[PDB]
Design a protein around this ligand. Structure first.
Ligand code: 2GO
Ligand code: 2GO
Ligand code: CLA
Ligand code: CLA
Ligand code: CLA
Ligand code: CLA
Ligand SMILES: CC(C)CCCCCCCCCCCC(=O)OC[C@H](OC[C@H](C[N+](C)(C)C)C(=O)O)OC(=O)CCCCCCCCCCCC(C)C
Ligand SMILES: CNCCOP(=O)(O)O[C@H](COC(=O)CCCCCCCCCCCC(C)C)OC(=O)CCCCCCCCCCCC(C)C
Ligand SMILES: CNCCOP(=O)(O)O[C@H](COC(=O)CCCCCCCCCCCC(C)C)OC(=O)CCCCCCCCCCCC(C)C
Ligand code: HEC
Ligand code: HEC
Ligand code: SF4
Ligand SMILES: [Ca+2]
Ligand SMILES: [Ca+2]
Lengths: 854, 193, 145, 192
């Protein structure tokens, strides 16, 4: 019902304008307070932490600032009575505290002024408005009625009380004013160009970060005056975490030069539109604000998504966040593990949330404009191609059905591969199949001289096979040195010390002398079992990442390859010599063999040193797409391939209801067949006919998109935070992940448990956990087919309570009627509860800290 | 929830520590404040309170990937290990509070069923330092990734496990109110580690 | 219907001695602890003078085979009675604080894998069922306080 | 008492015409869940809550708070043995559950059976019928195009509201109680 429907579009320009201006002023006031909460006397919290890397990059927050101040703008600055700078003269203040204070006060002064001016456009629109209607809970105070009956913002008044003297934009005769939203598209983008210039001038001259190529030769640091290229990060361009000079466009001086690049481009595109404003017939219906609202709100959502992607890559390894890891960040008394990456992950996931919510909502507001065209009979008359291209119902069913299919196939591939490899990691016997784990055994170096008992088959390739334990010539079970294992051997699970796979007995050697493509510089015998390590390559992004990367690093890649090949030959010849020793039989033949491995030891040592050092170099090359916690190459993983397939399939799963909003807001093929028509955009059903009809309206389709999208959004959260998404049960400490140099915190389910060990260390985080879990499940009370039961039972309760009131004498109890939510308002609040319950719990996953190895 | 967090304790400085080295501690490539008004007090204060080895460690530096990080090969030099109580306290309480509290309690007396209880003297007397390293590195019990006591050989470094080993001996004979303090570590170290 | 029984497989046990079920022995405390005491002590000498001739010689054959794989008996690190050796840091099984702060499942892997420097790994010496028996015998060393 | 008429029905003159009808609504705000079959399902769900009190209490959880730790000072000074405290019990027992690979497979299957009950219990059957219909049209288009006779008359079956509530209660119940079997199967860790 209508309480959230007070303000509906179309509105007139002065009212939209004025409320945007007022909201802008309001935000500037809130930011001003966030500037006050950044001052150094306070604890770290989530609000001041999400702004500190940016204020470090700007020069306003200075980490190495220790001195306390006593006179800076005017003679009264240590501490003083009634603060001297009210509530702040209690504590020691530094220069960054003063810089923060000042930018706070500046944001609160501008904000209040913008709030006032916005109100002048908003209420001077209506010819003025009285003080008691602006503030509205001001006539309740007594002996102040007279006060609240003056009229502000009047068309007539003396200068400090005018609104709009002409009454409206359309009536005021300033012949610069544009008269249609398409004509206004040109001044609005010149205006945004001007904003870009303002920012560039503030950065250059107030914050003192000039634009490339005009950066200084010298800059002041806490250790003296240094040259720009050696001065560390906040002062100069030396990145002290990665040990490199920064690229000039990876500094803030780069951002100030783009202030001018983007500002010139917006000014020129706006002057072009001044002279040839948009005029298409396909655009003309967009003057109605209901229609543009769709376009703008969905675009804005896409912009947020792109902020997330761009900001995540650009800032994942930037010194502004890594600098957080050097401060001594303590939140609700703890000490955070990698705060840098935690705050970085919060900001990007914030934006991804906003992205989804605005694309989904923008499309819903779209479906409302189309539904109204259908109600009023005008859909059929529409002239823009952007409506008529989609008017055919046979084309709509083919659009929806083939994206359902493409979703089906990608989600079956991804979820089926997750299920497969969780079966493999758990060693599950299904009667018809034994799943088998990854296990490795080192074949080289000292490890390669540990022996095992081996059951060795006679001839694998022929059935009516048979095998036998490996023996000595006298008949005792001989111990086989890991260096001498072969493909097909079986070693008992118990002797490798493995429980946890009780349904079978042996591990099988499937590959020998294996060297990870990307991993540890060691040689293994391996069981591959059922573990699909090839699936990392079933990712287009593996190949693009690794190709660009190979092209950029091709000489050290080639020397690494060649150093591996030399070490393998040298290890192979060492194993020959060791074996001749072991199989000597003559104290002389023993002694001579031992003599020749002794004179080959040096140069096995050398081949191993050479290989180790070339592998270390190769793994220090710069990243392209897939990176380390440093900023070094990693190869793509099963994790990255699954993420890739899951983004395709899971965003289609989430966005199919948006297509249904777009096509079937009025009639879908089910409806058309019965001759039905959706009469409003938000009805809950039309009852039990034809089996049941709940959930067909566009408001309901909106709720379904949001729930379904919870799934790609959790895959993003788990991936950002270091979870393994490619199985359900993966643990960080196991052989596959250590041999391939992979760090992760979990495995779908296993992540939930493992991260909560960290959540449990914080009492404030666990109270959030309890509450966010209470909110979610109450949503089930509102979403289940149950509302009739609830109304019938609330009627029983009302009756009882009124009985008690008659019996007891309690006049206020004697007419009580409990309100029971009807069907639409239940689906709305159930969706609100389901969404806020889940994403208060996801906040907790980011907020325990980030624990992937670095 | 937001903004009205408290005042920060003057004893926890924000004055910055040196950055974690890019080079691996296990590298064979090439191996392993000012006078400004208050900068010396702040550096001296950071030197006691702000931990240096709290962050997850480079992947080539984890104990399972370190050539000298296996239980059989690690060096438990008692002189280096029980050298400095400030340091044991600075490091082991940060690592313990983060990683180990969940299952062993806020008092370190056991939360998860059958979990250890580090204040128990009988448990203290019958464990070596090398024994304590083995169980952190291997985990305890049968399962994937260790058992109910999880394995740490990917996860932690040999140097991080050693701060943990020394810190854990400060639990001996304490009462069940939170974690060992700076003077628990110091009385532990005076009574020969 | 479903579990027609339940197909859980046959139980793993130790070596067979003729005329006396080994599978059964592995669930009967007095039989399993007699084999645990033999492993623990490295001899059949502390076994009840009531032990049969066939039993006493099957144990010896078990020990003789284990002596060729350089098996080191538990007693005499830990003593015939527990509570080892402070010198060698060998665990005292008589102690109640040590006993309360160990689960039997957990204890298993510390014998399988060995424990830090000196306590040796037994995964290549003994079967996991023989380690289970030893965890049960060590339980009976506990004293009060 | 209310198999035929409740006092809300009797003010309207309504009369329930059978024991298992799904509703009669959108009238009067909506009426889903008044039949006797549905009241049976709501009994089964509501009873999950005292039953899980019984399970936590049998297996040694502490039920008087949500985060009791095993050896907190209070429990130690008053010789109380427990395994966890409402929520904490859940994570405490599951670390023991994770050490068994058969029980972790059971845990995975149990979770999947349950949340699928939500598909069947949410007010959504019309959405599912109208999408199923798009799916059938599409598959028949593919059959006709590719000349595949087994597929030119596919019609996907979509449960009506009554059968959706039945199978939704079945899936909800069995999910939960395979998962509870695990809290018993893991061991009894109360040490007395
Ligand atoms: C694990 C420790 C602890 C315990 C005590 C615990 C228990 C329980 C119980 C119980 C009685 O035991 C319940 C009933 C429960 C309930 C909840 N918990 Zn809960 N819970 C804990 C902790 C947490 C935490 C931190 C969180 C939840 C979160 C949530 C949420 C779950 C909200 C929801 O419906 O989420 C669907 C999303 C899921 C399951 C995440 C999926 C991740 C994965 C990587 C996605 C990618 C792969 C898939 C296979 C899908 C591929 C196809 C597709 C993309 C189309 C609710 C309140 C919640 C969450 O997952 O939200 C997305 C969250 O963040 N929970 N939870
Ligand atoms: C580390 C813990 C681990 C992880 C992997 C995990 C996560 C999650 C998530 C997630 C995304 O994070 C979800 C969504 C989830 C879902 C579930 N899990 Zn779940 N889950 C875990 C583990 C388990 C296990 C072993 C079990 C569940 C059980 C269940 C069940 C629970 C279904 C349900 O509705 O159960 C209602 C009952 C509850 C919540 C138990 C309340 C117990 C309490 C002691 C009763 C008394 C106290 C209250 C204050 C009582 C009210 C008073 C009166 C009316 C009685 C479902 C499938 C389930 C269960 O709770 O069943 C009652 C179960 O047995 N889960 N669970
Ligand atoms: C938090 C859990 C919660 C609570 C407290 C309730 C409460 C109730 N439900 Mg609802 N319900 C729930 C979840 C819950 N439900 C879920 C998950 C579903 C979906 C299966 C439903 C589906 C549903 C149906 C179909 C029906 C109900 C009905 C009822 C009422 C039963 C009549 C009565 O016996 O009074 C006894 C009252 C109690 C035993 C409750 C005491 C209250 C609590 C614990 C205090 C509540 C705390 C609250 C969460 C905190 C927020 C407050 C904040 C200011 C602090 C009762 C008021 C029936 C009804 O009659 O509707 C009016 C009914 O027909 N429930
Ligand atoms: C049990 C309830 C509870 C308690 C006691 C707290 C306590 C607190 N919260 Mg948490 N919070 C909670 C629930 C709670 N929160 C819930 C349900 C959410 C989800 C919406 C959050 C989300 C949250 C965030 C995002 C933040 C906190 C913050 C805070 C701290 C500052 C509080 C504050 O400024 O208040 C004054 C608040 C008001 C007057 C309301 C405005 C304080 C430790 C801040 C902090 O940093 O923590 C360390 C912080 O940034 N709160
Ligand atoms: C991944 C699937 C999975 C697998 C591979 C297993 C495998 C096993 N189950 Mg579990 N089980 C599962 C899921 C699985 N179960 C689920 C979903 C439930 C809830 C219904 C159970 C409930 C369960 C019980 C109560 C028991 C087992 C048992 C078994 C074992 C013997 C099974 C058998 O005899 O089959 C042949 C039998 C049939 C095919 C049906 C008759 C075996 C280790 C038994 C065992 O003791 O193991 C420790 C046992 O008692 N199963
Ligand atoms: C496992 C969870 C699951 C799966 C796989 C589905 C599947 C689907 N839902 Mg249901 N749904 C779910 C849970 C699920 N839903 C939940 C929890 C709710 C409550 C909100 C709903 C509520 C609901 C509504 C209201 C609607 C749907 C609709 C859809 C369909 C979307 C059309 C399409 O996108 O094709 C793409 C197909 C896929 C993307 C999935 C592929 C098959 C999957 C991956 C795996 C099969 C897994 C299954 C568990 C395997 C067991 C197999 C057995 C052999 C073991 C699709 C068939 C819409 C529809 O059109 O109706 C028919 C629809 O309207 N869903
Ligand atoms: C949002 C919060 C910040 C609080 C908001 C302010 C109030 C806080 C404190 C609680 C206020 C409780 C008032 C309840 C009340 O009196 O309700 C009466 C009411 O209406 C009936 C008549 C008006 N006719 C109907 C004549 C027009 C009236 O009183 O004004 O109601 C409702 O119908 C809603 C239900 C209110 C809940 C009251 C139930 C109390 C439980 C008693 C049960 C047991 C008996 C035996 C005591
Ligand atoms: C623990 N650290 C893991 C990340 O390590 P690292 O640093 O190595 O590597 C980058 C991945 O991180 C991202 O960069 C994720 C940012 C998430 C915010 C961004 C998440 C948003 C993803 C997509 C948004 C879709 C929206 C707009 C529909 O690893 C990447 O390659 C990701 C590239 C993403 C591109 C996938 C292309 C798929 C096409 C989708 C089609 C959809 C439609 C048809 C409907
Ligand atoms: C006229 N139409 C409406 C009125 O009639 P109406 O609705 O009763 O018709 C139903 C509805 O449709 C469904 O209800 C959808 C099933 C397909 C979803 C398909 C999705 C199912 C997968 C779910 C699995 C998830 C679990 C495992 C978590 O009537 C039924 O289906 C009654 C349920 C009986 C089904 C019995 C299943 C037993 C088969 C097992 C053996 C088969 C093979 C092994 C050979
Ligand atoms: C998942 C829960 C869990 C986490 C996380 C955890 N532990 Fe434990 N811990 C246990 C359990 C359970 C035992 C008891 C093992 C047994 O006997 O069964 C234990 C035992 C130990 C023991 C005694 C080992 C021995 O052999 O006697 C040490 C030492 C130990 N934990 C240390 C730590 C340290 C240090 C951390 C953090 C690095 C840690 N624990 C994290 C659960 C956990
Ligand atoms: C050479 C000495 C030696 C032999 C032989 C020996 N142990 Fe030990 N054991 C030790 C020492 C030393 C420790 C102390 C371990 C440590 O550092 O914490 C120990 C520790 C233990 C512990 C306690 C482990 C724990 O987790 O807390 C058990 C149980 C144990 N041994 C059992 C055995 C059994 C059973 C055998 C024979 C099968 C055996 N030991 C053989 C020396 C030995
Ligand atoms: S249960 Fe509700 S949504 Fe379903 S048909 Fe009846 S009134 Fe409509
Ligand atoms: Ca995290
Ligand atoms: Ca239990």
């Amino acid at each position: 019902k209508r309480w959230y429907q007070k303000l509906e579009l179309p509105m007139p320009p002065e009212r939209i304008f004025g409320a945007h201006m007022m909201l802008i002023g309001g935000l500037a006031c809130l930011i001003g307070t966030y500037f006050f909460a950044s001052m150094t006397m306070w604890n770290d919290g989530y609000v001041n932490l999400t702004l500190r890397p940016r204020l470090i990059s700007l020069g306003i927050y200075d980490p190495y600032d220790t001195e306390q101040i006593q006179r800076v703008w005017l003679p009264l600055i240590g501490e003083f009575s009634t603060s001297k700078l009210p509530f702040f003269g209690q504590y020691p203040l530094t220069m960054t505290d003063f810089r923060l204070f000042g930018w706070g006060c500046f944001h609160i002064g501008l904000g209040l002024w913008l709030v006032y001016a916005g109100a002048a456009h908003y209420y001077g629109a209506r010819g003025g408005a009285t003080i008691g209607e602006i503030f509205w809970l001001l006539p309740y105070v007594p002996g102040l009625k007279g006060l609240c009956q003056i009229k502000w913002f009047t068309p007539e008044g003396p200068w400090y009380k005018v609104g709009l003297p002409w009454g409206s934009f359309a009536n005021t005769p300033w012949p610069i004013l544009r008269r249609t939203y398409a004509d206004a598209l040109s001044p609005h983008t010149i205006y945004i160009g001007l904003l870009f210039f303002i920012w560039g001038f503030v950065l250059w001259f107030v914050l003192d970060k000039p634009p490339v190529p005009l950066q200084p030769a010298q800059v002041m640091t806490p250790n003296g005056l240094m040259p720009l290229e050696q001065a560390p990060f906040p002062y100069g361009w030396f990145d002290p975490y990665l040990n490199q000079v920064m690229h000039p466009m990876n500094t803030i001086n780069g951002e100030t030069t783009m202030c001018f690049v983007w500002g010139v481009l917006f000014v020129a595109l706006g002057a072009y539109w001044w002279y040839r404003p948009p005029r298409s017939i396909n655009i003309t219906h967009l003057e109605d604000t209901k229609a543009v609202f769709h376009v703008h709100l969905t675009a804005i959502g896409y912009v947020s998504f792109a902020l997330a992607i761009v900001g995540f890559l650009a800032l994942r390894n930037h010194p502004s966040y890594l600098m957080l890891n050097d401060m001594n960040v303590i939140i609700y008394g703890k000490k955070i593990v990698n705060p840098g990456r935690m705050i970085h992950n919060m900001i990007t996931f914030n934006h991804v949330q906003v992205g989804l919510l605005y694309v989904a909502a923008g499309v819903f507001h779209g479906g409302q404009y189309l539904h109204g065209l259908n109600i009023s009979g005008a859909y059929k008359q529409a002239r823009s191609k952007f409506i008529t291209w989609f008017q055919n119902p046979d084309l709509q069913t083919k659009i929806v059905g083939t994206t359902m299919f493409v979703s089906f196939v990608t989600v079956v591939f991804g979820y089926g591969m997750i299920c497969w490899n969780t079966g493999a990691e758990l060693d599950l016997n299904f009667g018809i199949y034994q799943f088998r784990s990854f296990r490795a055994i080192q074949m080289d170096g000292e490890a390669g001289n540990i022996g095992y008992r081996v059951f060795r088959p006679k001839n694998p390739w022929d059935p009516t096979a048979g095998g036998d334990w490996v023996k000595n010539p006298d008949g005792t079970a001989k111990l086989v040195k890991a260096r001498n294992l072969q493909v097909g051997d079986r070693i008992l699970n118990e002797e490798l010390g493995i429980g946890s796979s009780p349904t079978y007995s042996f591990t099988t050697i499937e590959e020998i002398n294996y060297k990870p493509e990307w991993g540890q510089p060691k040689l293994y015998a391996v069981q591959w079992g059922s573990w699909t390590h090839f699936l990392r390559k079933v990712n287009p992004l593996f190949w693009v990442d690794k190709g660009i990367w190979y092209l950029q690093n091709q000489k050290t890649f080639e020397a690494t390859r060649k150093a591996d090949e030399a070490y393998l030959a040298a290890h192979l010849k060492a194993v020959s010599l060791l074996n001749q020793i072991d199989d000597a039989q003559t104290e002389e033949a023993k002694q001579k063999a031992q003599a020749e491995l002794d004179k080959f030891r040096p140069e096995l040592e050398k081949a191993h040193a050479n290989m180790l050092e070339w592998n270390e170099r190769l793994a220090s090359t710069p990243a392209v797409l897939y990176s380390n916690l440093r900023d070094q190459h990693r190869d793509g993983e099963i994790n990255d391939a699954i993420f890739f397939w899951l983004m395709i399939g899971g965003w289609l799963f989430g966005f199919i209801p948006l297509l249904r909003i777009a096509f079937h807001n009025y009639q879908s093929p089910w409806y058309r067949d019965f001759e039905w028509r959706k009469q409003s955009p938000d009805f809950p059903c039309i009852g039990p006919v034809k089996g049941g009809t709940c959930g067909v309206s566009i408001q309901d389709q909106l709720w379904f998109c949001i729930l379904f999208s919870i799934k790609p959004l959790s895959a993003i959260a788990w991936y950002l935070d270091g979870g393994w998404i490619a199985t359900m049960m993966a643990r960080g400490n196991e052989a596959y992940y250590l041999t391939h140099n992979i760090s992760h915190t979990g495995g779908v389910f296993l992540y939930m448990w493992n991260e909560t060990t960290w959540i449990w260390t914080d009492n404030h985080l666990t109270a959030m956990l309890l509450l966010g879990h209470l909110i979610w499940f109450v949503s089930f009370a509102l979403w289940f087919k149950d509302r009739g039961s609830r109304a019938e039972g609330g009627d029983i309760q009302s009756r009882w309570v009124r009985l008690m009131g008659k019996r007891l004498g309690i006049k206020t109890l004697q007419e009580v009627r409990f309100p029971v939510s009807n069907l639409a308002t239940a689906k709305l609040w159930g969706t609100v509860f389901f969404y806020t319950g889940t994403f208060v719990l996801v906040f907790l996953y980011f907020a325990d800290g980030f624990f992937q190895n670095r | 929830g937001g903004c009205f967090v408290g005042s920060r304790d003057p004893n926890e400085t924000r004055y910055p520590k040196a950055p974690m080295p890019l080079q691996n501690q296990t590298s064979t490539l090439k191996t392993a404040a000012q006078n400004t008004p208050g900068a010396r007090e702040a550096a001296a204060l950071r030197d006691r309170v702000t931990p240096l080895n709290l962050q997850q460690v480079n992947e080539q530096d984890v104990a399972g990937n370190d050539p000298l990080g296996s239980p059989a090969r690690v060096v438990l030099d008692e002189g280096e290990m029980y050298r400095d109580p400030v340091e044991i306290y600075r490091e082991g309480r940060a690592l313990f509070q983060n990683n180990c509290v969940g299952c062993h309690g806020h008092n370190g007396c056991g939360n998860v069923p059958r979990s250890t209880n580090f204040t128990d003297p009988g448990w203290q007397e019958n464990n070596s330092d090398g024994g304590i390293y083995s169980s952190i590195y291997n985990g305890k019990g049968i399962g994937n990734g260790g058992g109910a006591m999880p394995a740490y050989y990917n996860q932690l470094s040999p140097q991080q496990i050693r701060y943990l080993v020394a810190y854990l001996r400060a639990f001996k004979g304490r009462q069940c109110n939170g974690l060992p303090t700076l003077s628990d570590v110091e009385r532990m170290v005076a009574e020969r580690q | 219907v479903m579990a027609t029984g339940c197909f859980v497989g046959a139980r793993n046990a130790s070596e067979p001695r003729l005329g006396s079920s080994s599978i059964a022995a592995s669930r009967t405390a007095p039989a399993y602890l007699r084999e645990a005491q033999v492993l623990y002590e490295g001899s059949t000498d502390g076994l009840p003078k009531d032990t049969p001739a066939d039993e006493i010689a099957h144990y010896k054959a078990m020990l003789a085979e284990l002596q060729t794989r350089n098996y080191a008996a538990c007693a005499g690190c830990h003593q015939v009675n527990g509570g080892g050796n402070k010198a060698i840091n060998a665990t005292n099984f008589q102690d109640a604080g040590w006993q309360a702060n160990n689960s039997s499942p957990g204890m298993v892997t510390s014998i399988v894998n060995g424990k830090g420097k000196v306590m040796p790994a037994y995964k290549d010496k003994l079967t996991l069922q023989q380690i289970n028996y030893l965890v049960e015998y060590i339980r009976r060393f506990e004293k009060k306080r």
